[PDB]
Amino acid sequence: MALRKKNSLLNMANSYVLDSPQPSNLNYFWNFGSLLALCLVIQLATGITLAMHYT
Amino acid sequence: VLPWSIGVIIFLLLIITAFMGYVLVFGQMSLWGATVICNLVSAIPWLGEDIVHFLWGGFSVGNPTLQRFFALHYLMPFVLAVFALLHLIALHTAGSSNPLGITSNVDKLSMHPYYSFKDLITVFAFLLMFTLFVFFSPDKLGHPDNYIPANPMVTPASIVPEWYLLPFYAILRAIPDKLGGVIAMVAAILILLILPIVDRSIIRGNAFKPISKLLFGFFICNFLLLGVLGQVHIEPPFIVLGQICTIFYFSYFLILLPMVSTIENIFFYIGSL
Amino acid sequence: VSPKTRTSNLKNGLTIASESNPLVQTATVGVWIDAGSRNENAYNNGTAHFFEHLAFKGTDKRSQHQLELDIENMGGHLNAYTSRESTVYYAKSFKDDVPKSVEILADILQHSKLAESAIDREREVITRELEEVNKQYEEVVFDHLHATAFMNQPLGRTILGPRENIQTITNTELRKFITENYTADRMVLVGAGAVDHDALVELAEKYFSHLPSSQSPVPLGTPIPNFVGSEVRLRDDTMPVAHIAIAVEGVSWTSEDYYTALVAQAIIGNYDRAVGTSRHQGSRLSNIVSENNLANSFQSFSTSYSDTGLWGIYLTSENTTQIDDLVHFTLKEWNRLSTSVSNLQVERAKSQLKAGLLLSLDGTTYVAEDIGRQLTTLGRRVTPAEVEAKLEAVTEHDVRAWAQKTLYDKDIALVGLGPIEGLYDYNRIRNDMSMMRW
Amino acid sequence: GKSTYKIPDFTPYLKKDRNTDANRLFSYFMIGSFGMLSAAGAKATVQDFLSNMSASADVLA
Amino acid sequence: FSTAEAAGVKVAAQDGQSPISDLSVVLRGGSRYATVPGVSHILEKFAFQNTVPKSALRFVRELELFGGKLYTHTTREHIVLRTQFLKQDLPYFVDAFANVLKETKFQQFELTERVAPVAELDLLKRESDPAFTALEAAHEVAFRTGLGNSVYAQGYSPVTLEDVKEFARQVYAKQNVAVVGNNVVPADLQQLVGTAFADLQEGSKVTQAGTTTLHGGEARVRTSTGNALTIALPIAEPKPVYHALASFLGGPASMPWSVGASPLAQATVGTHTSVKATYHNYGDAGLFAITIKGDSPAEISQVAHKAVQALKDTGAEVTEEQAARAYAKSKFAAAEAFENPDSSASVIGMELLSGVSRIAPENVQKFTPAELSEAAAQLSASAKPVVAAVGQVHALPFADEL
Amino acid sequence: ASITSVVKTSELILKSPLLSKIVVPLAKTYVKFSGYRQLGFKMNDLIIEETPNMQLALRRLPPTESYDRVYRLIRATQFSLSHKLATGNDITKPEEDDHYLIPYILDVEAEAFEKDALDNLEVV
Amino acid sequence: ASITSVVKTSELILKSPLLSKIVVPLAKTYVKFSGYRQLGFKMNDLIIEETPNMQLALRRLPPTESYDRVYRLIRATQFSLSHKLATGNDITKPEEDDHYLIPYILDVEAEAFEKDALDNLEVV
Ligand code: HEM
Ligand code: HEM
Ligand SMILES: CCCCCCCCCCCCO[C@@H]1O[C@H](CO)[C@@H](O[C@H]2O[C@H](CO)[C@@H](O)[C@H](O)[C@H]2O)[C@H](O)[C@H]1O
Ligand SMILES: CCCCCCCCCCCCO[C@@H]1O[C@H](CO)[C@@H](O[C@H]2O[C@H](CO)[C@@H](O)[C@H](O)[C@H]2O)[C@H](O)[C@H]1O
């Protein structure tokens, strides 16, 4: 068995981002979920950095 | 091994979290502790000084450093909670170990209600200790100098970390070299990662190992002595004592535990023939 | 040390090749032809296989029934097979029944009736064969493998041919096929076992002397294939066993890398859970597969043709949730032929092959098949001393260099049959043809 | 429509030079360029962004 | 094959001109001698397991370095263990057989994890063919015990490690062992067997518990995986004419895409069925069988009637042509059997372990039409016909219908 | 450490007269102070089992030995949670402290180590 | 909404001459504009199946109907991801748009609803 399946931590990531079985016909409107994840990552990085300078 | 190795990182994150939080008061110990601990980074070769100025956001500990420590002190507990969750998910593949060191697959109990109700006892014991300090002696564990506002000009009589960092400070003092001392101090925590290798026992745990139990007792008391030596003055005879205790600390991992665990394997085999 | 293979020619250009064994009492004589389905076009695809049926349906002298009786009276049997590049017709008999068998073979090849009544009768028999190969899963998998790897090219066609052609094959096109292809310079008369070479040459002069020669005689085993990386999925949830083949373009008979490809094939090797020794084999893939119950079997192959080949593996598995692991571990073992193999694996595989190439030939039919195959693909029988020297010349550097240009990061042809839901899409399979860590 | 050995028509898509090193090298040039700009973009992003932590203009003054 | 004796062990070898040698140990340990059902199959599968000098793992890894191969099978009469290797590697193979016979550690985990599962897959693969099942069922009806014991291990009656260890204590002994070397220099083999098998127990000849008794009857193995029917006739006096009769009646075609000119082959016309007559000599009794497989129970039934008719018709009159065809087909069958290493080893094994001299293919007797018809007549007029039906047994014939 | 290692080193000591004279009495005292017999365990019950090799050895135990081991583990767990010690027949006597598992694990490890060696063979 | 409901209401409309005269032509245009036939679907292929009742009805389909449904779903998915429409024989003609599933789901639901009623019976 491949490590990505055998190790429980790796397997959680594997189940969501790699082997996760998707429909083969998602259109571009299924891309907003990953855009929202990107916005959340940008807001965390910029927000924590602003907090280092904001009073 | 995996929950233990993630656990060692949890412990490093707790140290960083607590250190940054202590600076936020901006009393004398806050400032001078930040100064001396952050200057250890200057030991990193070539780029060390540059890294320190980058951490401080200036040429000494000041407003930029305090505002960044606030933002990081707020964040780091969330990172710590994630790693705490990770070490439990990693543990869930084997389950909890137990004091006998044997499998418990033969005899399991549900977490609830048994361990829920057993946890309440220690929760209330903890809350009693909490109450005695918070309401009756709130400053017993602190340093009075932290009630003096930070003053970059006056240096306090003795600059020590909070008590829980003291053993690592004694280990750092033991090595005369600056970089040497920093490495030793970090190694004192990272060496926990080799316990899975240096323990050569065929048996899990110390319940049935009289010599291992004695060695463990000495290791723990030595760790407390290192703590005490972390806050004494750099004077005779504590300088040499700190070095001997530091050697004992490391030799537990590198020499004694591998030797003792090897011999006990042989004694269990021969002794039970 | 085996007896020397004697070789003679006739005037038309028919080769006679023989290897006597004074310890046996039977003999295999037959005719190996350098011709097969690949010589057909798209319109007469199926002809060569159609002829094989009619060859036993009666000649100008002996009728179908007389033919049956004549062979029954000989005591042995006749056998035939048509492949993509080779056709064989042979007769196993007693020592002293060899002149009868040569005479019958000469008759069915030169003087077959191909009577419209018999064409029409077999046209149904062959039509029924189209719906019953379906059961021979290994054959289904390999025929789809050729069809896709050599997409729209002659090597990609099946031997049976399409249903449409079976209904339209005439005696004219049958006759045309065997007149164009069954020529003396493409044929070898082979004898193995209790045969005298000089006796066999006389029988060849008696029966195969009036064979046509081709206008332009090329040497035996003379041929452009353009491999297509591609996949065929034949999912069938009701089957319990998945059958999967994966192949890359391999080597021809006369490649300089022919032995290097055989050694590489032996490093992966075969496995079968039903054989007792298979759990103890040295192959890394064998160990992975057996320890984790990933497969019932796997069989590495290196199939050669005149101008191309296919090199790969055929897997069978009931472990339908771990097909991904099976394919993953197999292709990571192939990666190691490029990245990791050393003298350890190479010298072990060479040892195993030095014996294996000799062990295979353990009866007169195997010997005849070896003489016939080698004469029709290489133009000569290669002595075991030459074979031992070519194997010894294979180094670990040769294997690594071969795998780096043949396997590493290359397109595969992939066929899956059965419960193959767990077999990932083409990209994820083809991504295992390289290692990001290297 | 019925025989599964007759591969469907892929001629509208098949490249004639599909097995050549030139053919693979082109696709890896595209992947490589993409990886190159992503590396240069990440480096620029990280450098400009992290510089916020170096002494600000009022501190340097 | 020059028969000799080396340190109490019978050794037969024939030198040749090939790089490939076959060494076979033939053991008098087949199923007719089986103490408990299936033990001879289990013992066969326990060969080349862990010995005291060499583990199964080490043996397989070293065998791969020599490029050797290993073949084992169990019959009603013998266990045969064959190795195929290059001529020069003979000493290694002799020593390996010595380790197996002298020093096999019969360990419980090997039985549970290695030996028994492989024995079970072996049987399941054989039974995939309903004709195998039918012919096995027929021997069980005809002989009950001894020759009627199952050859293979079955799940309903489990073999224990103590069963296998006891049987091996009997079988692995100088009295039950013959060594047969194809393409082995006979003088060299005698020298090596003489040093390697010197400390093997002498033991005693393994014997069949009880005399061979013949019985008629019916077996109705209901399967869902194909249809077959055996019509067997137990023979109290095995005679070589039944070989000629089996080859005469025939059944398989001698030519691709054909039915064949044999009476039994001609019984299958218009049906997708096959047929095969076989004769099994077991020294003290014999079995003449005609097995018919097919997909249609109706067609099998149809052929079965024609098959018994064919036998009756043969008992009436054979032509001279047909008798000569029988001699030819029979000489050929004999020759190819003496060539095939599996059957070869057992043939000389029988000569060495019993005393039944081999009949060379060149010395196969020609039977007159009188002798053939007389043999078929005895079979058509048997008091004890056996019929084993496999598959849709409600639709297959019964003995009294035939 | 592997059981193989422990057993081989022990055998070196038991061979040397001097060494055995000084080590055997120590080992017996060690076992007495260890106190696992006071929870009704046999020494081999304590060996770490969460390993492929040990899981294979435990599967090869005869059913009787296996059922008895399960009972000793359950019984010791009940003494542990109650903070009691074994009394009477529950205490393991020195003559009952048999190495029931050692032969199985030594065979498992023998094959495992031979496989490692043979994976690294070099044709000469 | 349940298939039972939809079927019963539809039958009320089809009964009423007036209602059918005005609803049937509208329903036919609606189906034409819906455009599921241009992806080779039959109407019943579109019904939500992630419910216990529908899973049971699909399990009761005859094997051939079931294999054909799987092919239409795969084929329509391939048209969807390619942004193409069916052409030729892949387009569902009105005469091929049969209610293959409706009888199975109506039987599943009949029992489910009878069970609900009978769970609430009151002995009189
Ligand atoms: C979902 C995530 C978030 C959203 C939608 C969000 C939204 C906003 C918005 C709308 C503002 C006003 C910006 C302006 O006009 O100047 C702002 C300011 C701010 N945010 Fe966030 N934020 C998020 C996450 C964070 C995080 C994680 C932090 C960490 C502290 C943070 C720190 C700040 C700070 C310090 C300011 C004030 C300085 C400024 O205006 O730029 N934010 N945020
Ligand atoms: C925020 C800090 C931590 C939290 C909240 C936490 C919580 C827990 C909990 C709830 C368990 C299961 C119950 C128990 O055994 O007590 C556990 C087990 C464990 N933790 Fe932690 N932990 C933390 C830090 C650490 C650290 C620093 C280490 C190691 C250096 C560690 C190593 C482990 C290990 C090895 C176990 C498994 C112990 C066993 O059951 O045998 N944890 N932890
Ligand atoms: C999105 C960022 C990536 C980080 C992953 C997100 C963290 C959330 C993960 C924890 C939630 C548990 O997630 C759960 O994991 C198991 C295995 O990992 C998955 O289980 C799935 O995959 C595994 C194998 O890949 C199979 O054994 C299983 O049959 C299948 O359902 C669950 O479908 C998923 O719900
Ligand atoms: C693991 C990652 C490694 C550590 C990351 C390094 C952190 C900080 C490194 C350098 C950051 C400052 O480095 C400095 O960056 C700014 C851009 O940001 C550059 O400045 C350059 O561009 C900026 C705008 O883009 C202009 O205002 C400036 O006049 C010009 O010189 C300097 O030329 C460089 O010296």
Side-chain angles (χ1 to χ4, degrees), chain A residues 24-25, chain G residues 77 80:
Chain A
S24 63
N25 64 323
Chain G
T77 303
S80 167

Side-chain angles (χ1 to χ4, degrees), chain C residues 15-89:
Chain C
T15 301
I16 303 93
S18 197
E19 194 202 301
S20 63
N21 183 19
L23 199 39
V24 294
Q25 274 234 284
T26 63
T28 304
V29 300
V31 179
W32 271 253
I33 313 177
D34 189 32
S37 310
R38 190 203 173 146
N39 282 261
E40 307 154 337
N41 51 68
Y43 305 112
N44 68 333
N45 163 226
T47 302
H49 181 261
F50 213 114
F51 178 74
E52 184 198 337
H53 285 246
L54 255 8
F56 300 98
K57 268 348 132 247
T59 82
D60 62 333
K61 291 150 216 191
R62 2 170 98 95
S63 72
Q64 207 267 339
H65 197 43
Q66 198 44 63
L67 190 47
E68 264 156 359
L69 242 108
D70 285 321
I71 294 145
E72 232 95 15
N73 279 292
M74 184 186 55
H77 58 273
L78 254 77
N79 194 37
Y81 48 95
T82 306
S83 64
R84 286 175 171 88
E85 280 211 312
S86 180
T87 316
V88 179
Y89 289 89

Side-chain angles (χ1 to χ4, degrees), chain B residues 1-12 14 77 80-81 83-85 87-88 91 95-99 111 119 189 192-193 204:
Chain B
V1 173
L2 185 58
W4 165 255
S5 308
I6 298 166
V8 171
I9 296 160
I10 296 168
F11 176 65
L12 287 167
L14 183 72
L80 183 93
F83 277 81
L85 176 60
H87 99 308
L88 289 198
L91 179 66
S96 302
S97 184
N98 64 78
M111 174 78 221
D119 288 334
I189 296 161
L192 294 172
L193 296 166
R204 178 184 289 100

